[PDB]
Nucleic acid binder design. Structure first.
Length: 49
DNA sequence: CCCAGCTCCCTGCTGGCTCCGAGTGGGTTCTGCCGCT
């Protein structure tokens, strides 16, 4: 049944228990932005990483 | 008035040099030291 309206879904749905894994890759360890931060000594371009 | 060097040019081979996808996240170790001057 659709949760929003309570109506049945016309097609029947394949459902059951499946072993799932949480991988170490999490968005909060990847998100990054920069607006004029530190720069390299030799060339004066933004730092890496 | 032919021939053997001699020169000059073209081929073919071998050796030498440069290049080898785009981003991104972590980790670790290493950046000298010893004999005797």
């Amino acid at each position: 049944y659709n949760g929003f309206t309570g109506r049945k879904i016309t097609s029947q749905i394949f459902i059951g228990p499946t072993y799932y894994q949480r991988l170490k890759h999490m968005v909060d360890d990847k998100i990054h932005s920069r607006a004029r931060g530190p720069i390299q000594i030799l060339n004066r371009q933004p730092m890496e990483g």
